[PDB]
Design a binder for these strands. Structure first.
Ligand SMILES: Nc1nc2c(ncn2[C@H]2C[C@H](O)[C@@H](COP(=O)(O)OP(=O)(O)OP(=O)(O)O)O2)c(=O)[nH]1
Ligand SMILES: [Ca+2]
Ligand SMILES: [Ca+2]
Ligand SMILES: [Ca+2]
Ligand SMILES: [Ca+2]
Ligand SMILES: [Ca+2]
Length: 901
DNA sequence: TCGTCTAAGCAGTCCGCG
DNA sequence: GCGGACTGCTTAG
């Protein structure tokens, strides 16, 4: 097999690399890597190295990495560009792995761990590490084993050994329900003291040294706690054994309001799963506790115990250990589903970066582009300092707030990357500028043609057409990968709909789920077999189809995020290829493209319907248009359709055979007008929306920009078994909206869109009557909480104190003196409830840490004083009045002359 | 919330608006 | 009450 790196570090003048050799074995080596950098040189000097602009360069070979770094400094002192890859480990990987890396994940040691620390006096601060570590569960992916290190004797209590037999039993047997599929994979090690536990942990770690290290909050909690605790007990040298190169660094992570410390372990790649989840999941959650996320992702019940966590070990050590094991397993289950580790390895090896660098699109693109240019003996420019400057983005059309019965939407495939490719936008392809007309003049094709030579953007930039820039070349490669995975995702989705249909008629038999690849559209043979399957088999198949869809989603959406991130990186001052000329070339072209095509679509449809000045495009945002199809349906007449699926078919056909060819023609003209390199503006139909045939549903509504709802029957070629709501921006989609309120508002919208006014009025009346019985957590608003200290004046709200911060201050006063009460953590999320006039808390609201029950000390008082009236008006009635006034209907029945009887 | 970008919505504070 | 200036937070893209 081909060799591949596991980790790489620079330590002084050495590269330390862990790698898999040609025999599949893990090795480590120290290499006195001599880096090269570059300087511009005269024409007369013959060289093979050229900078991205074609200027000749001489290569400078350094005796060591420190010499190279010092040279860079002196070049700055002189005022001359020092060219080349200044991150020497990236240069090392590029030299050592000069081919497309094929990696074997089965050889990569992925460790998932979690620790427990009993603490009487509140949260155990990792930088202090003053409390014993009393449990560690460490899963090793190569062994496929959970290694459990259990402390039996502690200053906080002596306990009995954990029992695997009780752990395996049902909760209803008094057991812990540790899943049977992991029972035989547990290696349990009890210890009579913490020193021996930690010494044995370190010896184990030496034997089974993680390459990828993950878990939940491991970077901010578990790693620093373990490092600092070992440091406190044994000294620094012992703690540094967590690094295979015995080198660690405290790294200060800074943000707007403060900073925190993490421990960098040289020779390990830490990918904290909470951070992987935040970057790759495309969710915004009210809480990021593992229990909350586990419930959301896996539909598993919260890990239930009595008393505070600080007393769990002494009261129920059995459960304490079991829950530690389950916590580790839950992260593995989330990963089995989401496949974020797989994604990280894919992107990391593709770019040839340290795997942990997948968190940084700038680092990722820097490496991809460097490797690409190096292949042609081209030399990358020095990174420069730039001041942060605002620049313009997308165009968003102001919609007329209204109901919209029939809607078809269209949008560009990978819009910004396609613009980069079409225009040929790259650092080295800038050809010059032209005199810009107002955007409106390009949109309306009255401005003079920008260039007869170069490819243009309406921001005034011109680009070479003779050859692809490195940015278009590399962005295309990742786009092609994204397209492959999106294909698999969409097939799995369509396959899921076939199974849902079959589930209407499940057969009474005992059989098995079919062994199929859900990434490919089901053959006729498979479809026939599906129609004969039991509900049990069909449901298992649906689960598997949906898991395949999730895997495809992760792979496609994050590759889309990577390529969109390059468009963004061009507008970030830390990017080597920062250039506001290019960043704005993209966004300004986009503004034109949208408004150009709005004009073209309106023109096409006015012609088809034989009208003039009629607005068919009702809305658009960035790269999308929403077209009213009422007139198209009416040209046929509703009574001519057999059912809903019949008109959906008709619109699908109209979009594919009439609309899209008109759109394509419109964009081809725009490409010619801008003299672009290649036509790549592909605006395919997204949604087909409308009410059920014969219903009083309104189909859709807009309240304003980025705020709308649509009843969708077909989405990107997926024909749904049941209509699905596409809701954007409304309160149902916001993590700040109470859970039960999102639910209720979604049902109000469903009724509006599918059933009509009377149905909405029936539901509203019921919700208003019953909502006070809803659990307090389900009706609490959620907010992130920043700058709590800024607004805290002697425990009371200072000037301009935000509502949620006021709630936190109320909470802090209510729990004052308690070392044990859950503290609100700066920058994390809180639940917020309004309080009735004259409450004991002395203010109008209270807030507490999200994802948790409020502490028992005050729970009773909160429940008693919760202001249901304010809650209802603010979170439910206000948004609903917004929806209904936009859609021109009433959520309450107005009086009529019929009331006289 | 360490980690690519801008546009734009709504909640809430403070205070004007005769 | 509402709106604007402003902060804070959260979306759509
Ligand atoms: N710089 C930057 N631009 C973004 C980001 N998200 C969206 N955009 C811009 C770039 C996208 O191409 C454009 C349109 O967004 P879409 O959500 O329609 O995605 P896109 O067209 O890329 O992919 P699609 O093929 O429609 O799934 O909006 C981002 O995180 N950073
Ligand atoms: Ca725990
Ligand atoms: Ca798009
Ligand atoms: Ca599409
Ligand atoms: Ca059947
Ligand atoms: Ca779009």
């Amino acid at each position: 097999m081909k060799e591949f790196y596991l980790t790489v570090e620079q330590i002084g003048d050495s590269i330390f690399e862990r790698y898999i050799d040609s025999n599949g074995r893990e090795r480590t080596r120290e290499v006195e890597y001599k880096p090269s950098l570059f300087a511009h040189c005269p024409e007369s000097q013959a060289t093979k190295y050229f900078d991205i602009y074609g200027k000749p360069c001489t290569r400078k070979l350094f005796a060591n990495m420190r010499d190279a770094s010092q040279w860079i400094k002196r070049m700055e002192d002189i005022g001359l560009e020092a060219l080349g890859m200044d991150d020497f480990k990236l240069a090392y990987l590029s030299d050592t792995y000069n081919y497309e890396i094929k990696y074997d994940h089965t050889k990569i040691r992925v460790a998932n761990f979690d620790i427990e620390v009993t603490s009487p006096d509140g949260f155990p601060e990792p930088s202090q590490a003053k409390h014993p570590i009393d449990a560690i569960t460490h899963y090793d992916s190569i062994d496929d084993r959970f290694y459990v290190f259990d402390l039996l004797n502690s200053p906080y209590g002596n306990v009995e050994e954990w029992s695997i037999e009780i752990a395996a039993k049902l909760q209803e047997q008094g057991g812990d329900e540790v899943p049977s599929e992991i029972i035989d994979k547990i290696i349990y090690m009890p210890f009579d003291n913490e020193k021996e536990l930690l010494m044995e942990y370190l010896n184990f770690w030496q034997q089974k040294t993680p390459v990828i290290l993950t878990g939940w909050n491991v970077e901010s909690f578990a790693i620093p706690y373990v490092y600092n605790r070992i440091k406190n007990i044994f000294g620094e040298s012992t703690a540094k054994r967590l690094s295979p190169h015995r080198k660690t660094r405290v790294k200060v992570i800074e943000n707007m309001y403060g900073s925190r410390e993490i421990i960098t372990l040289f020779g390990i790649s830490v990918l904290d799963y909470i951070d992987l989840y935040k970057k790759f999941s495309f969710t915004n959650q009210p809480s990021y506790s593992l229990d909350y996320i586990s419930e959301f992702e896996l539909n598993v019940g919260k890990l239930k115990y009595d008393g505070p966590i600080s007393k769990l070990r002494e009261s129920n050590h059995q459960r304490y250990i079991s829950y530690n094991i389950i916590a580790v397993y839950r992260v593995l289950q989330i990963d089995a589903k989401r496949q974020f580790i797989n994604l990280s390895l894919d992107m990391g090896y593709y770019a040839k970066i340290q795997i942990q660098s997948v968190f940084s699109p700038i680092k990722t693109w820097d490496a991809i582009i460097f490797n690409s240019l190096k292949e042609q003996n081209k030399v990358i420019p020095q990174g420069r300092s730039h001041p942060v400057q605002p620049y313009p983005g997308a165009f968003v059309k102001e919609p007329i707030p209204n109901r919209y019965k029939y809607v078809m939407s269209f949008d560009l495939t990978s819009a910004y990357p396609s613009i980069i490719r079409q225009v040929n936008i790259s650092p080295e392809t800038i050809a010059g500028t032209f005199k810009v007309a107002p955007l409106h003049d390009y949109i309306n094709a009255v401005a003079e043609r920008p260039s007869d030579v170069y490819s243009c953007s309406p921001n005034g930039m011109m680009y070479y057409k003779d050859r692809d820039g490195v940015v278009p070349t590399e962005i295309t490669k990742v786009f092609n990968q994204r397209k492959e995975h999106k294909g698999y995702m969409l097939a799995a989705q369509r396959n899921g709909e076939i199974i849902k249909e079959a589930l209407h008629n499940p057969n009474l038999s005992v059989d098995e789920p079919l062994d199929v690849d859900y990434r490919f559209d089901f053959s006729d043979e498979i479809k026939e077999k599906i129609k004969k399957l039991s509900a049990k088999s069909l449901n298992e198949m649906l689960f598997r189809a949906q898991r395949t869809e999730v895997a495809g989603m992760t792979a496609q959406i994050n590759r889309k995020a990577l390529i969109n991130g390059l468009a963004g990186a061009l507008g970030n001052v830390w990017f080597r290829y920062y250039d506001l000329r290019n960043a704005t070339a993209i966004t300004t072209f986009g503004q034109m493209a949208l408004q150009w095509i709005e004009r073209k679509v309106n023109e096409y449809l006015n012609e088809v319907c034989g009208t003039e000045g009629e607005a068919f495009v009702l809305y658009g945002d960035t790269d999308s248009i929403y077209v009213s199809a009422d007139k198209i349906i009416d040209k046929v007449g509703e009574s001519k359709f057999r059912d809903t699926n019949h008109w959906v078919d008709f619109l699908d056909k109209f979009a594919r055979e009439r609309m899209e060819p008109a759109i394509d023609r419109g964009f081809r003209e725009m490409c010619e007008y801008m003299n672009n390199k290649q036509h790549l503006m592909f605006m395919d139909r997204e949604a087909i929306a409308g009410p059920p045939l014969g219903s009083k549903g309104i189909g859709g509504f807009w309240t304003g920009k980025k705020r709308y709802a649509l009843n969708v029957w077909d989405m990107e070629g997926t024909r749904y078994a049941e209509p699905k709501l596409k809701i954007m921006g409304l309160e149902t989609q916001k993590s700040s909206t109470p859970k039960a309120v999102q639910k209720a508002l979604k049902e109000c919208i469903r009724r509006m869109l599918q059933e009509g006014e009377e149905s909405l009025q029936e539901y509203f009346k019921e919700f208003e009557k019953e909502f006070r019985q809803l659990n307090y957590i389900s009706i609490a608003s959620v907010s992130s909480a920043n700058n709590i200290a800024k607004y805290d004046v002697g425990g009371f709200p200072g000037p301009k104190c935000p509502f949620h911060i006021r709630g936190i201050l109320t909470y802090n006063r209510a729990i004052k003196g308690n070392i044990d009460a859950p503290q609100v953590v700066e920058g994390e999320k809180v639940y917020v409830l309004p309080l009735r006039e004259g409450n004991p808390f002395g203010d109008k609201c209270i807030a507490w840490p999200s994802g948790t029950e409020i502490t028992d000390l005050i729970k009773d008082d909160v429940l008693h004083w919760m202001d249901y009236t304010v809650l209802l008006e603010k979170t439910f009635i206000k948004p609903l009045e917004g929806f209904t006034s936009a859609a021109k209907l009433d959520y309450e029945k107005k009086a009529s002359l019929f009331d006289m009887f």
